[PDB]
Curated annotation (Swiss-Prot):
Recorded family membership: Belongs to the peptidase M3 family.
A Pfam entry, by short name: Peptidase_M3
Uppermost EC category: hydrolase
Designated name of the protein: Neurolysin, mitochondrial
Binding, Zn(2+): H461, H465, H468
Enzyme Commission number(s): 3.4.24.16
Length: 665
């Protein structure tokens, strides 16, 4: 199969039945184990590049591809049975993945290969493959005595149970509060109308996000915001505090047994940040540079509160409490740049946004997008596109667009890698495949689907991952697509969001759905000018969370709540409510990427450096810079370190000048 057609390069099945998913799962695991069994028994002196490295690499490709037909349906299939089977498949496959990574016999063979092998006779990416594989083995303790490995296991198995419990608690929580309409003042009728009513003249308000935020952002009754904030930040307090008290010390022990000083050092080693000290300095210096901006905003908010308390006689306490931050930050947006989102959206018909988004990217990256006519999909609402390189006709890959909310479908925005763009056994390249999964407002009444600006920003964000997935071309599957450092994966996505704050780009993405008139120059200037409203406190709040995250993985004997309170008053200027335990509701800690929360802010600094220093310098639609970004930042996927690719693109080490200049510092 050629690199100049898509024909036959994508045969992923999206209509598998629950029994077919079960069968394929059982067959994948067994057949794949046999390959590791075969590599794990090769005589150490007989280990070679073809019978070892090439064997492990070939199996990684075939395995990852079969695995996606099995673990993806749980996120998009409309059939409840199919979804459950996929979830089950993902559980068996995930346990199998752990098993294989714990194969001491296989580790031995790769360690010996790297020795007896002349690393200078093989491609740089294959050297990286070996080094990274051996490194992952050491990180799993495969070089340690059997006694120590067993200890690490009994601890990791207990840390998984703890994280699953921490999360289960928060998810199964159904705490509720009852308020009279008087107590929910200022809240929209659309909000109140959707609330359940009790046998009293009261409305039920849960603690789930859809209820919590509009109440913290719009409720003009201070005491209501107060009770919500108290109840919301006390969820699972006992249970999860108890879990954290066991979990963090466990993370410390495991790190020690592995040879690291702290769990943080363990996590950060695989990131571009590299170490605990580097992250601490990153966050510490940022909050210092941001301090003055936080003092002004905090001051501005204070003048708004004191003033409003007099115009309603609520009483003033001279301070910004936790249950006041969102509220006054919203008031700020309405006074600085009154941007009516429900009005603006009318200028963003999904049809127009989609066409615009794709047009921009085709021109910027030298690509051509063509929709697949009668494409095999998991839902009639999904469209499939084939991606060719404008110049050569080369088919880089395909991407699916799943844009509307649907029962059973993943409810958050994301980009899934379905097929890696790596080499196949005969040297031919596997076509990359990605699925963009978002949930944009569907067409209501006679009006088409209309996107708010933040949704247009999400569309671009996710499409940034799609392009990373599709343009990434490596020799090995493990370095393909978005397999870059965790604190680097959000670089491609956040850099592309800059385009939705670009006047000229916005013109290409909007047209009033009715008469089709463009957005007024006056409104455009206002929209882009409001990009940084409240950036001070917002960023400081992100730094607070980032510090808590590092702290809980640098220590152990630490009280999560007090640590959070400490940074809240020291960095944010808004005290943490006495009696609450935000960290115990911090889903990021347990499951996920603990010790890496700073990653998002870390990535913004870099994306901002590239956008300003390169695209702004040369013109953000300049094809030359566009191609360099694709070739130097996207194309290599994870086959090169993040900082090296940044250097390659910038032609100097990255720095935060741009990130600070934008913020206005
Ligand atoms: Zn021991
Ligand atoms: Zn992202």
């Amino acid at each position: 199969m050629s690199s100049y057609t898509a024909a036959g390069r994508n045969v992923l099945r999206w209509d598998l039945s629950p029994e077919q998913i079960k069968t394929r799962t059982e067959q994948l695991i067994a057949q794949t184990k046999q390959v590791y069994d075969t590599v794990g028994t090769i005589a150490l002196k007989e280990v070679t590049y073809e019978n070892c490295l090439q064997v492990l690499a070939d199996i990684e490709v075939t395995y990852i591809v079969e695995r996606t037909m099995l673990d993806f349906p749980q996120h998009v299939s409309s059939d409840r049975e199919v979804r459950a089977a996929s979830t089950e498949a993902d559980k068996k496959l995930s346990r199998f993945d752990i098993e294989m990574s714990m194969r001491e016999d296989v580790f031995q063979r790769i360690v010996h290969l790297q020795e007896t092998c002349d690393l200078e006779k093989i491609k740089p990416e294959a050297r990286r493959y070996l080094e990274k594989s051996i490194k992952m083995g050491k990180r799993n303790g495969l070089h340690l005595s059997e006694h120590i490995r067993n200890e690490i296991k009994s601890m990791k198995k207990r840390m998984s149970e703890l994280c699953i419990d921490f999360n289960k608690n928060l998810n199964e929580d159904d705490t509720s509060l009852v308020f009279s309409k008087a107590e929910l003042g200022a809240l929209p009728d659309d909000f109140i109308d959707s609330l359940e009513k009790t046998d009293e003249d009261k409305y039920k308000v849960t603690l789930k996000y859809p209820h919590y935020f509009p109440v913290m952002k719009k409720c003009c009754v201070p005491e209501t915001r107060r009770k919500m904030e108290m109840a919301f930040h006390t969820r699972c307090k006992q249970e999860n505090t108890a879990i954290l008290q066991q979990l963090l010390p466990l993370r410390a022990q495991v790190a020690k047994l592995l040879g690291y000083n702290t769990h943080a050092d363990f996590v950060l080693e695989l990131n571009t940040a590299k170490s605990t000290s580097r992250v601490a300095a990153f966050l510490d210096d940022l909050s210092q540079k941001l301090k003055p901006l936080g003092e002004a905003e905090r001051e501005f908010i204070l003048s708004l509160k004191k003033k409003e308390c007099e115009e309603r006689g609520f009483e003033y306490d001279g301070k910004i409490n936790a249950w006041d931050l969102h509220y006054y930050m919203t008031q700020t947006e309405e006074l600085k740049y009154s941007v009516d989102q429900e009005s603006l959206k009318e200028y963003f018909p999904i049809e127009v946004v989609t066409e615009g988004l794709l047009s921009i990217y085709q021109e910027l990256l030298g690509l051509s997008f063509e929709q697949v006519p009668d494409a095999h999909v998991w839902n009639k609402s999904v469209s499939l596109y084939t991606v060719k390189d404008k110049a050569t006709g080369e088919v880089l890959g395909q991407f699916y667009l799943d844009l509307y909310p649907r029962e059973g479908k993943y409810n958050h925005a994301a980009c899934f890698g379905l097929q890696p763009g790596c080499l196949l056994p005969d040297g031919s390249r596997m076509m990359s495949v990605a699925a963009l999964v978002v949930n944009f407002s569907q067409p209501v009444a006679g009006r088409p689907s209309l996107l708010r600006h933040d949704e247009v920003r999400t569309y671009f964000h996710e499409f940034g991952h799609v392009m990373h997935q599709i343009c990434a071309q490596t020799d090995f599957a493990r370095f393909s697509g978005t397999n870059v450092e965790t604190d680097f994966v959000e670089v491609p996505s956040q850099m592309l969001e800059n385009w939705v704050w670009d006047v000229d780009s916005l013109r290409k993405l909007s047209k009033h759905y009715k008469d089709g008139h463009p957005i007024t120059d006056e409104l455009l200037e206002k929209l882009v000018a409001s990009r940084l409203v409240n950036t001070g406190l917002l960023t400081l709040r992100q730094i607070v969370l980032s510090k808590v995250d590092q702290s809980l993985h640098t220590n152990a004997t630490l009280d999560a709540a007090s640590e959070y309170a400490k940074y809240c008053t020291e960095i944010l200027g808004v005290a943490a409510t006495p009696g609450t335990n935000m960290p115990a509701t911090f889903g990021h800690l347990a499951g996920g990427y603990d010790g890496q929360y700073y990653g998002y802010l870390w990535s913004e600094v870099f994306s901002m450096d590239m956008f300003h220093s390169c695209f702004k310098k040369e013109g953000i639609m300049n094809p030359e810079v566009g191609m360099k970004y694709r070739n130097l930042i996207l194309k290599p996927g994870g086959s090169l370190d993040g900082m090296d690719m940044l250097q390659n693109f910038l032609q100097r080490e990255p720095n935060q000048k741009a990130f600070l200049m934008s913020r206005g510092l």
